[PDB]
Design a protein around this ligand. Structure first.
Ligand code: HEM
Ligand SMILES: [Ca+2]
Ligand SMILES: [Ca+2]
Length: 315
């Protein structure tokens, strides 16, 4: 189909996304940058979608974190999410799409701004949310591995799919884990969707980049990086360690698995056969240029190898 401004997309119902694309690239992502607003929007896709439990309810990727913000931003695991919920709300009021479509659309557009990134498949048509998520369904940085895997398993994700979704922490920082150092990132390249996150979490912890006593924080290997206790444990746990290592220096697998498992997350609570595919509206991401690496001056003896089947690669 050809839309009114002459841009084309495979399914004509998708034409309505083009003005919304332009508005968010200008006014939400500050001129299509891979910056804080993109990271916050990507985190919002997960905090919206994961509100889904067969036994308790929640409609998953349904926009409930905006439509019922009053309730869901009270949950302690949503700390800090209110800023990006407030920022997105006027876009939803002004355009003609549901909050659940908007959150996943903004997350996929945001990701496409980051070098190395992918186009997450995007479907249009989710109805407005009809219930707030239940409480206590969002994993925290201080939860054990078994707790996190049980929660993600309960929403439909295997342990390998959790590892794949955690490539999101390649373009990510924390504001609330240690409030004295907000904006400190989880890897050395928070503007680049690459395997540095899986590398650098495998390094021996050395110091705390701000204060020492913060709940859900492990020691970081670098003054300018922060480490969640969850990522520290998942990189080392026999249930996830070999998968975590396998992402290192494996950008094709990161890209393939992150797109497919993000599309699955974006569809929790929904049925794709009732929606329309508008994947082709998402911009084309830049590619990587630089090779994966240990941080300069580090070597294999600084890596805590945790996969008995396969040694950590020589980078
Ligand atoms: C699986 C267990 C997970 C845990 C325990 C977890 C935990 C966290 C924590 C504690 C933060 C920092 C919040 C702050 O203090 O500001 C965070 C940030 C973030 N998380 Fe996760 N996360 C998990 C999975 C996910 C998934 C599946 C996504 C996929 C979208 C995601 C995307 C993000 C992003 C993009 C940020 C950076 C937000 C920003 O820079 O503004 N996380 N994560
Ligand atoms: Ca939700
Ligand atoms: Ca990165």
């Amino acid at each position: 189909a050809t839309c009114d401004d002459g841009r084309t997309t495979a399914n004509a119902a998708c034409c309505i996304l083009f003005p919304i694309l332009d508005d968010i690239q200008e006014n939400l992502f500050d001129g299509a940058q891979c910056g804080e607003e993109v990271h916050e929007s990507l985190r919002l896709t997960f905090h919206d979608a994961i509100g889904f439990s067969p036994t308790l309810g929640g409609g998953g990727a349904d926009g409930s974190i905006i439509a019922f913000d009053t309730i869901e931003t009270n949950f302690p695991a949503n700390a800090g999410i209110d800023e990006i919920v407030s920022a997105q709300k006027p876009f939803v009021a002004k355009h003609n799409i549901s909050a659940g479509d908007f959150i996943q659309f903004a997350g996929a557009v945001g990701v496409s701004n980051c070098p190395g990134g992918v186009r997450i498949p995007f479907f249009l048509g989710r109805p407005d949310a009809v219930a707030a998520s239940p409480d206590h369904l969002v994993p925290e940085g201080f939860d054990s591995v078994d707790s996190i895997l049980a929660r993600m398993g309960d929403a439909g994700f295997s342990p390998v799919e959790v590892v794949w979704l955690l490539a999101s922490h390649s373009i990510a920082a924390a504001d609330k884990v240690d409030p004295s150092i907000p904006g400190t990132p989880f890897d050395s390249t928070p503007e680049v969707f690459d395997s540095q996150f899986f590398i650098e979490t495998q390094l021996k912890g050395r110091l705390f980049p701000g204060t020492a006593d913060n709940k859900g924080e492990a020691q970081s290997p670098l003054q300018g990086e922060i480490r969640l206790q969850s990522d520290h444990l998942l990189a080392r746990d026999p249930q996830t360690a070999c998968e975590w290592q396998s992402m290192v220096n494996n950008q094709p697998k990161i890209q393939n698995r992150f797109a497919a498992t993000m599309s699955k997350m974006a569809l929790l609570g929904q049925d794709k056969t009732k929606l329309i595919d508008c994947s082709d509206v998402i911009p084309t991401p830049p590619a990587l240029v630089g090779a994966a690496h240990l941080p300069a001056g580090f070597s294999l003896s600084d890596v805590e190898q945790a996969c008995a089947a396969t040694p950590f690669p020589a980078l």
